[PDB]
Each structure stands twice: as C-alpha cells, then as structure tokens.
C-alpha cells in the first residue's frame, strides 16, 4: 500500500510510491503519532549503503551498469574489504551533498536543490585550515548581497578517532550573555555558545547583537578560538517603508544562513563538520527570531510604538506587530539588495517543487509542520497540502554536541 | 527516563512522559517507515470487549473499580449481549461517555471545556419530525440568546438489521453554495452537494451568498425529509470592523452556533449514528478559514482592494494584513452582539492549561499538532512551541460515510 496524498485547495490526488526507497525508521508506530517531535530519541553494512549510494551516482549520469560503473563498485568494495572504510570521489561527493538537500523534509527551499555550490575542504588537517576554508565558504555564499547557496564539507569520521567539528550551530550568531538578575542581553538562544567562547578565552562585549566567534575542532583537540574579519560578516539594518520610528529600535540581522552543527551523510561516510547556507525566507527572522518569547521577544515594545491595545488578546496586538516586523524585514532586505524570499513566494516555489518531484521521482519527504510558515499558515498553499514524511539517504541529521 | 514518548515544550524547556497513549487500543495511519500524521482523513465477542472496556471506564470514573456492582453491571453486559447481540447504556453511562468522547478528541483545541457539556437523551426518538423537535430543542438550549452553553443530542444507536437515524447536513447551520452556469459558486463551496441534495429533494432555492440551509432528517428505513429552520431560531451576527467604516458595507456575517451533525459517537461498541454537538466558535474558524480559504468565501482580494494594499506582490505582505483585519471583525462583532466567541490566543493559553491538566489525571493527552495549531500567528501562540502525541481512544467522535 502507498500512501494516497490530498490537496484540498484543488480537490487533486497523488500517490507516493517513493517512501518505499526510505532507509530509516522515523518516531512514528501504527499505536502514536510523534510527528511533531523537533529531535529524535559493520563492513558489510557501511559496504550495502556505498553500493547503494554508488548506484544512485551511476543512474544519475545515465552511466548505470557501465565500465566505469562497476570499476567503481570494485574500487569500494576493495577499500572496505581492507582499511573497513572508503573515500567518496569529488564529483560523487557534489551529487551527494545535493541529494542529500533534496531530501531534507524540512526545508521549503528546496525548488533550488540542484543549485549548490560544493567546497571540498576534505583535505583540512587543523582548526587553522578550517578557518581558512569557512572565510572563503562566507565570502563566496554573500558575494555583496546577492546570495548562493554553498556547502563546504571537512574531512569524514574515522573509527579511530575524535571528529573535525564547528561548535557554534551557525557560522554567524549573536551572543546571549546571561544577566545577574535571569535575563538575557541578546540572543537567549546563543547563550550556551557564548559561555564556550568566553571561558575558552573570548573577551566578550555587551550589545544585542554582538557576532559571536568561532570554535572550530579538529580531532581529539581542545577547539580554538577565531574571529571572524566584520568586514566579511554582512548585516541588514531594520526599518520599516512606513513606521518611521522602526529603524530607532536599533534592529538588525545577518544576510547569511549558515547551519554548522549538522551530519552529513552520504553512502555510507559521516560528515560531521559541513557547513551549508543559502538564503532566508523573511518569517524565519521577523516571526521567529525577532518574536520567539524565548528569542529577542519584542512584540510588545513594537505594539506600544505602534500604540496598540495591550491589554487584551482579543485586540489582536500581537497579529498586527508581527506582520508590521516580517514587513520591516522584507523591506530593509530588499532596500539593501539582500537576497530574502517571503513566506508567499517561497510556498508557492515549494508546490512547485512537489509537483517536480512527484514527476521526477514519484513523491517527495515533506514535513507538514516545518513547511507551513509561522505566521498566515492557511494563507499559504502548503496548508491545504497533504504530505508523507520520510528519511531518505544521502542526508543532513542531528548530531550530539561535542562538549 | 522512562519508556513512554517523551514530549517537550521548547519555550519553557519542560518535559513530560505521555503514558496514556498505553491505553489506545486502536492504530493510527502511522509505521515506523513514513508519518502520515497531515493527512485529514486517513461484531459478537469483539462487542464484549469494548463493552467491558468502557464499563471499566465507568467504574473507574466513578471510583468503584472491582466492586460487586462493577462486575454485576458487566455481568448485566454479557447477559444483554449475548442473547440479543447489542446491549442498552445507563443514561449516567451516556452521559460519562459522550463527555469523554469529546475529553478524547485529539484536534479540538476547546477540551478545556469537556466536564462541562450538557447531554440530551433522546434515544427515544423515533420520526424525522420528531428528530426535528430536538434538534430546535437543542439549538434553543445551545443558542441562550448569545450566552452559548455546549451541548449534544444523542439519538438512538445502530441497531442490528434496522436501518440508521442520520442527519445528512454536516453542521445544523449551513449556507447554502450555488454552482453557476459560468461555474463559480455563490455562497459558500463547501456546501454544493448539500444544497444539490436538498433541491432534490424539493426545498425551493433562494440565491444569496448566506441562504440559510434546510436541514435533511432520516429515520430508520426512510427516505429522508426536509425541515426548514424557523429563522428566528438561527442568531446570526453581521460582521463590522471597529475602524474601518466601510467593512459593514461588505454585508459578511456568520451563524452564532458551531453544531457538527455528521459524526458517529461510539461508546463501548454502540454507534451512536446522530449525535449533534455545539459549542462556541474560535475566532479564526470564521474570520481565517471560512471567510478567506481560496476554497471557501475566499474574500481576502476584496477587502484587501478596499484597504488599498498593492495586491499585486506577495511581498507587500497584503494577504497577511487582510486576514489579520477581518480576523479583528469577527471578535468586535461577536462582542458587540453579544455572542459567546473565543480568539485564538485566550483558546490556546486555555488549551495548555488543559494539558498540564490531563498530564496529572491521566498522564497525557492526545493531540494533533497540525490542527490544534492556529491558521494565522501560529508560533506566536504558545501551542506552536508544544510538542504533542497523537493517538486514537474511546469513547470516540469519529468520521461516518455519507449516507447517500
Ligand atoms: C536557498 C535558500 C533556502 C531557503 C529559503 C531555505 C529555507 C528553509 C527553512 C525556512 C527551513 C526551516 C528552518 C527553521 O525553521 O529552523 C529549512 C530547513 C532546512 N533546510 Fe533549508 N533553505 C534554503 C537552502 C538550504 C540549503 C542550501 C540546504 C543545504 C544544502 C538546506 C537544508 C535544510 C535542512 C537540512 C533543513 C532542516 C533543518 C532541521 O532538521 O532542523 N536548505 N530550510
Ligand atoms: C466549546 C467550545 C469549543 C471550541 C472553541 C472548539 C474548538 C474546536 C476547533 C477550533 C476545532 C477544529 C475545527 C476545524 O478547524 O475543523 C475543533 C474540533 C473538534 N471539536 Fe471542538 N471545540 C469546542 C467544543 C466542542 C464540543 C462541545 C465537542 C463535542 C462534544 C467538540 C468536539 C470537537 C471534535 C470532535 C473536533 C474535531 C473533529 C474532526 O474534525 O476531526 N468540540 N474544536
Ligand atoms: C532551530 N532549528 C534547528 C537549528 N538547526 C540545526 C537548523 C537547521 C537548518 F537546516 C536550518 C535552520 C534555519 C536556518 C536556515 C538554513 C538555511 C540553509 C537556509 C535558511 N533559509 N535558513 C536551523
Ligand atoms: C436506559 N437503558 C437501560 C438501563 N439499563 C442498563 C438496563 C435496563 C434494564 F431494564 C435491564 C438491564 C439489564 C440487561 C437487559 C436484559 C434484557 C432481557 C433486556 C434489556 N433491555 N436489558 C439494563
Ligand atoms: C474536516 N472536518 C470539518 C467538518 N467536521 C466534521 C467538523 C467536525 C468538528 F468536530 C468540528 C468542526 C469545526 C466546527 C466546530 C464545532 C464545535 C462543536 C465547536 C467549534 N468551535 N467549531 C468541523
Ligand atoms: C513543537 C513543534 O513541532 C516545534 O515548535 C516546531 C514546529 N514547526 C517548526 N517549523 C519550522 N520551520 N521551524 C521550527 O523551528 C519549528 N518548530
Ligand atoms: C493538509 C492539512 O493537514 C489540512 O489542510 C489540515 C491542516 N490543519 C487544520 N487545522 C484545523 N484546525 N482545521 C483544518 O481543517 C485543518 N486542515
Ligand atoms: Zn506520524
């Protein structure tokens, strides 16, 4: 049985046959639904997910069952049969990495998975080295403003040893500095991270939105320490096309998404340090982390200034700062030509990309929760969507904390 | 920690353990292999087992759990069942079990409410006009003139070899949806069949946009019959706008009286084919999906046009600014019309009080994220930053195929 798929905006049917490739176990039994959970609770093996992995690579240059095809499919099984692992090729390790972005369930910016640029810093032996191929990664993805989208990928685990690791969750993130009192200055969700950099010797500031450095990790080290040169780090002022009061708040955010803290895994291998960006789309920073109560929270100050009813819900304060704050983002993002998405047009790149898919590969792991934005939920297309959530290699997973 | 679903609220950094799900004894749509958790919709000694289940259900509630009147009751049961193939509920057991079949619904949002539900017995009805009679009933006694009190009617249950009471509308108010020759819709499209369904069966059409529909009545074994509605039965509230002037020329408005009547109750294995329920509505149910889903009355292009938005790119956030207005409408008119209503902040603070509640009383509660959630403003409610465990008990509201 394949799972029949609803939209209800349009009356249309699909059926999604492609779960049935999934690799992994999801949270979910027949007995409870754990969708909505954010986290989750040898040789022979790592060779079958290389074989597989390697005719993935085959059919996707229609080379499949050719000469080079099954020199290769000796190659691994040669390198396995006498060292226990083996060594990606450089152009299988670009077609992994964007597998593995096409089949992240929760990203809605998938339309643009074929467009990634790939460093290979695989040859990275030190903290140092890291640093230098992350200031190149920064420089490359920002480009002035007009953003593309980049992985940069250290060096693979090995059994015997400790893994080459970025601390921070993201290349660029300002500092949470915990008060006397309970309070946060900053972001509260960086104040783990900031307590690192500090006690491995940063000397920390007191602003908002103070650029953390870095801890970057190679194997079986104490992290070091690096800052990044401000002039690489791009940042947009906040202001509003109409609240000419807005820009004295003082709000600003950085042009550029770099998640640092994820797994990458490809046929096999473990990437444990492969920092990938592309672009925001405006709800992640005008909903959630300007307005998250646990993240910069400021809602109220923005309805005051906006002299709104307070005091009850049903005044709806809160609905109407929040859309005066994603505008405000939009706005100072384009005023600044920094590449942004809105909510709106990203949903409907995302239909689009279902559609692709459901041609291309017949269904496509889609995770209702994290695709439907933040704010005007039914507003958007992805709403009336039904979808299929499932765990497809190569991919992007959580993994422990190093500390 | 424990072998339970751990389930976390990542605003507050709390955990809790779900052990209720334990006791759900039906599966879901979910494997282990791909989470199906988005999609809408997805008996001889098999009687005695839900029937002694829930009768457990009873006795516990009722704190006399292995008592000799507990196992005389199931005892009772067997008996019933075993020389007739159903059995009868106490009417304390009908009431126990449609107020646990609502304390049990994983999408409401509103079970804060659930002890508090008034329960009319009419297990003894027997006509489409008599269903009728307590349907007004229920409506007058639901309605208060405004001051909504909740309430179910229960009909009498499936019985073996005789056909079944239904109620073929989907809620006790409805507008009617008129298919046009150039294949548009006036009036609302989610209600097309059924307006077909009662031209069919002879009501004569009116042609607005808020025509209020007749309610289409089956006895057991009988075509069905139409019933109009006394207008004056029917609290309805013109929609205005506390600011913008022009918002009451739009000449929206929507009933007072949420009443579902297409869902099958089951308790203890009876199947309970009618059984109506009210409530209260939550503001965006109105203003947010019937009012503005491309589907639905989808007006959110004309009140953005009279707001003046550029409605011509989705960066001017214009769709976001007329939800949020005509969101604000539906809670100023309510208000001023006196009619119990609830936004969807006070409805999600309440629904997290209900969870801390049912984590101490039973140790969990079913819940389906996806729909708990608010179509608008979402993750500013303090249900988005809840996780939350889905899973299916009885006593049950469950979906029912159509009877045509
Ligand atoms: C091109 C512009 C892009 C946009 C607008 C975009 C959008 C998003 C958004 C909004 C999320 C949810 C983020 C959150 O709520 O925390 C997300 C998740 C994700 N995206 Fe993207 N994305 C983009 C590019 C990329 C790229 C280049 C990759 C990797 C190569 C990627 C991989 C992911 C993954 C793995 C997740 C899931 C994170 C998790 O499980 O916690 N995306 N995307
Ligand atoms: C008292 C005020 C109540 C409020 C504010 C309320 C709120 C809601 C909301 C917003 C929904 C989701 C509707 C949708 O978008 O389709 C809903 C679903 C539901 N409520 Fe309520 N509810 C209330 C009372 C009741 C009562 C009195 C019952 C039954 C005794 C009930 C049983 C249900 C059920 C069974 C569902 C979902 C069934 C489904 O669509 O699958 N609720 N509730
Ligand atoms: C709190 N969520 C978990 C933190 N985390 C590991 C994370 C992962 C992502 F893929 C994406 C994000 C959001 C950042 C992001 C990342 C990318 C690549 C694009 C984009 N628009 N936004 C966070
Ligand atoms: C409100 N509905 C009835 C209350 N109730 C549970 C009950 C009533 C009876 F008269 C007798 C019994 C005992 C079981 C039994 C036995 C027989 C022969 C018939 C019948 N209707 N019921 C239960
Ligand atoms: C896909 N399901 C839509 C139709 N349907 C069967 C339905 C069922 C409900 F319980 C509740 C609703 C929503 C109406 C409602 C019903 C009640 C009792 C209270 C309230 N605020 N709102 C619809
Ligand atoms: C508990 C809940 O699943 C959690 O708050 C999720 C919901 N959906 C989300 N969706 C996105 N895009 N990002 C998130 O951080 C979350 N948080
Ligand atoms: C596809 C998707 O599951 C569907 O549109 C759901 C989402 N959440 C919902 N939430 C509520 N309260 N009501 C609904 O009708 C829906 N529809
Ligand atoms: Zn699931």
């Known amino acids: 049985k394949f799972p029949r798929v609803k939209n209800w905006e349009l009356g249309s049917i699909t059926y999604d046959t492609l779960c049935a490739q999934s690799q992994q176990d999801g949270p979910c039994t027949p007995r409870r639904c754990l969708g909505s959970l954010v986290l989750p609770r040898p040789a022979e093996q790592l060779l079958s997910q290389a074989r597989d992995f390697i005719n993935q690579y085959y059919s996707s240059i229609k080379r499949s069952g050719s000469q080079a095809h099954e020199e290769r499919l000796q190659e691994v099984e040669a390198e396995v049969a006498s060292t226990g692992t083996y060594h990606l090729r450089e152009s299988e390790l670009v077609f992994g990495a964007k597998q593995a972005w096409r089949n992240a369930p929760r990203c809605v910016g998938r339309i643009q998975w074929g467009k990634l640029q790939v460093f290979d810093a695989r040859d990275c032996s030190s903290a140092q080295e890291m640093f230098t191929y992350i200031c190149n990664h920064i420089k490359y993805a920002t480009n002035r403003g007009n953003l593309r989208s980049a992985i940069t990928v250290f060096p693979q685990r090995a059994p015997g040893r400790g893994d080459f690791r970025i601390w921070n969750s993201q290349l660029v993130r300002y500092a949470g500095y915990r008060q006397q009192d309970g309070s946060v200055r900053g972001d509260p969700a960086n104040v783990e991270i900031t307590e690192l950099c500090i ?16 801890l970057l990790q ?24 109409t609240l000419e009061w807005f820009a004295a708040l003082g709000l600003r955010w950085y042009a550029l998404p770099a998640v640092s803290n994820m797994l990458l895994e490809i046929g096999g291998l473990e990437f444990s340090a492969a920092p990938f960006s592309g672009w925001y789309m405006s709800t992640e920073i005008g909903t959630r982390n300007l307005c998250d109560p646990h993240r910069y929270n400021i809602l109220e100050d923005v309805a005051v200034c906006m002299d709104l009813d307070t005091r009850t819900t049903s005044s709806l304060w809160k609905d109407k700062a929040a859309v005066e704050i994603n505008l405000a983002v939009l706005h100072s993002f384009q005023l600044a030509k920094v590449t942004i998405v809105d909510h709106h047009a990203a949903t409907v790149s995302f239909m689009k990309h279902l559609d692709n898919e459901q041609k291309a590969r017949g269904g496509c792991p889609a995770d209702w929760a994290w695709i439907v934005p933040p704010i005007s939920g039914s507003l958007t297309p992805v709403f009336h969507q039904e979808m299929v959530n499932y765990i497809l290699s190569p991919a992007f997973r959580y993994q422990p904390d190093p500390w």
């Open 218 to 241: 190679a194997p079986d080290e104490a992290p070091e320490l690096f800052v990044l040169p401000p002039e690489l780090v791009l940042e947009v002022p906040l202001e509003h096309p």
């Open 199 to 214: 006690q491995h010797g940063w000397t920390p500031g007191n602003g908002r939105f103070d650029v953390l450095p870095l």
